[PDB]
């Protein structure tokens, strides 16, 4: 009988893999763009004293286009407790809607499957994927992931493609920072109880709803804790040209008069957006 204002919720979002992808804005729901397939070869090293030439072989200019997909839902009430309530259902239930959209958009833009959802770069499977070698222990050939791999992966990016960041679940970073050499010394951050460099300088943006190869942070791997070879660990891509995210209209809320039968006030919300993978040569995937 002494109700507080405390509203402990204890629910989490992800990070946002949105400010990386190239942003483009369209008014209508159907855009189209051009693409240079290949310039082709034009002219050879001909001999001298030859009053002639060769036509070579012309290039190619493809013409692509993509749609924009919509996102809608419905929620309602009873109009009786909403007048007597000790809270505000709408301002909470509305708040519950972008939280569903913001997290659904990000994941679908990552793992979307074809029809009526933008094809994420995971399921596209045209990013080149690099799988790491397994190791030996007491004769067993368990798969592993050493710091030697991480430096090899990030450095193997073609330099002329540009600067590229990296994306990975924080449990991988905790796995990297906690590695140990033969004697017992740490590899990174020798003798300061914590290794935490400024990620922005090492160009490693972090997230939390990637496949997370270390299942619940419980598969470091010596015996039956092996990484279960064939799991995603991290990605790296020049995102400003490897993947685009298009936006048409932000979310909207509109009362639905009709269907509301004087008991059930029924609101309606929706939004339109989309995405598509550009040249999926800038960008590689590390795997176990």
């Amino acid at each position: 009988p002494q109700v507080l204002a405390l509203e402990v919720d204890c629910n989490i979002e992800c990070a946002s893999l949105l400010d990386l992808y190239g942003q483009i804005e369209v008014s209508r729901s159907t855009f189209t763009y051009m693409k240079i397939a290949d310039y082709g070869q034009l002219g050879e090293y001909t001999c001298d004293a030859k009053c002639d030439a060769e036509f070579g072989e012309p290039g190619n200019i493809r013409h692509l286009e993509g749609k924009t997909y919509d996102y809608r839902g419905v929620f309602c009430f009873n109009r009786k407790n909403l007048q007597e309530a000790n809270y505000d259902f709408l301002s909470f239930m509305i708040g519950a809607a972008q939280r569903s959209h913001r997290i659904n958009r990000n994941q679908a833009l990552m793992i979307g499957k074809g029809v009526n959802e933008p094809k994420g770069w995971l399921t596209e499977n045209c990013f080149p994927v690099f799988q790491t070698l397994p190791v030996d222990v007491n004769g067993t050939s368990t798969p592993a992931f050493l710091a030697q791999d991480w430096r090899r992966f990030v450095t193997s990016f073609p330099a002329e493609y540009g600067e590229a960041r990296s994306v990975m679940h924080q449990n991988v970073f905790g796995y990297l920072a906690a590695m140990v050499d033969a004697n017992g010394r740490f590899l990174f951050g020798d003798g300061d109880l914590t290794f935490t460099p400024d990620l922005v300088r090492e160009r490693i943006r972090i997230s939390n709803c990637l496949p997370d190869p270390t299942e619940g942070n419980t598969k470091g791997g010596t015996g039956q804790d092996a990484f279960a070879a064939g799991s995603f660990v991290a990605a790296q891509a020049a995102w400003k040209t490897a993947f685009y995210a298009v936006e048409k209209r932000p979310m909207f809320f509109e009362q639905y008069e009709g269907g509301s039968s004087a008991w059930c006030v029924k609101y309606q919300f929706g939004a339109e957006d989309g995405g598509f993978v550009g040249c999926c040569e800038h960008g590689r995937i590390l795997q176990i």
Binding site: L133, V135, Y175, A182, G220, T222
Partner: peptide, 20 residues
């Protein structure tokens, strides 16, 4: 929550010169 383990990477060094 049930007590979950915290298995961390061991002494990982080699991939091609396995001892005799």
């Amino acid at each position: 929550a049930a007590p979950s383990r915290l298995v961390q990477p061991g002494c990982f060094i080699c991939r091609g010169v396995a001892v005799s």
